UniProtKB/Swiss-Prot annotation:
Organism: Aequorea victoria
Keyword Plastid assigned: no
Protein name (Swiss-Prot/TrEMBL): Green fluorescent protein
Family: Belongs to the GFP family.
Effect of V148I: In Azurite; shifts the excitation and emission spectra to shorter wavelengths and increases quantum yields compared to BFP
Tissues expressed in: Photocytes.
Effect recorded for Q67H: In P4; leads to no detectable fluorescence. In mut2.2; shifts fluorescence lifetime from 3.03 to 1.94 ns. In mut3.3; shifts fluorescence lifetime from 3.03 to 1.88 ns
Processing and modification events after translation: Contains a chromophore consisting of modified amino acid residues. Maturation of the chromophore requires nothing other than molecular oxygen.
Reported biotechnological use: Green fluorescent protein has been engineered to produce a vast number of variously colored mutants, fusion proteins, and biosensors. Further generation of mutants led to more stable proteins (at 37 degrees Celsius for example) with brighter fluorescence and longer fluorescence lifetimes.
Amino acid sequence: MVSKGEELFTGVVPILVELDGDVNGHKFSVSGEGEGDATYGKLTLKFICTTGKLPVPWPTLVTTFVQCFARYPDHMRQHDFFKSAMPEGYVQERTIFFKDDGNYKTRAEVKFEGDTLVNRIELKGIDFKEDGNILGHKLEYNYNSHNVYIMADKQKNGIKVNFKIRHNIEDGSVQLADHYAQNTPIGDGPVLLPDNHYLSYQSALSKDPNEKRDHMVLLEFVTAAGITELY
């Protein structure tokens, strides 16, 4: 049978993203809108910096900007924590360590407000180099494919997630961003605590030729894998 959480994602769902950030005292806000299609693992989102110029590179915010939209194969449905927490939602806590630079700490609440899936985020960055790759805007406007590794944390009724992002630097080198996270349900009801598995991500960044505000257009596909003799 289809669970309550699963049922909320059977069609295309509107998404609203709202972020308030402070990186080395540079304060900024971003709003985003678009939609998610969990059957395809597909996100289509446009983000605007509503406070003016974004003080960090757009690519450094991609991972922060709704894992409930991952495509989970039918055979992996019992391992989809994110949809199981809906509609009440979950809280994602992350730390992102930029190698040889500062770190972001984020807290995101992911939940439905009516028919809209909302990703509401606070981000705090400290210890950045004012002329490094982040505050100096030395990162290319592109994005590599990565795997994201998920394990249960039964004690906390949630999951732990870790992965490495490699951001391309304009000189051909790479800026590593080591991610560590916890996701915990907001509600008090049962959730699905998964066996170890991963999500496979691919992401494409673009610009809207008619948009004069500082912005990012994101197309992202996300598929669960790692748990699999019928043939």
